[PDB]
Amino acid sequence: AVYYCILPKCAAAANVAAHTTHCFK
């Protein structure tokens, strides 16, 4: 998910469905 995202500027709207694409949790 996004909660386990260690990136400051990953998602624009804090979206996960679009973030997970690059982030492997």
Ligand SMILES: [Zn+2]
């Ligand atoms: Zn991320």
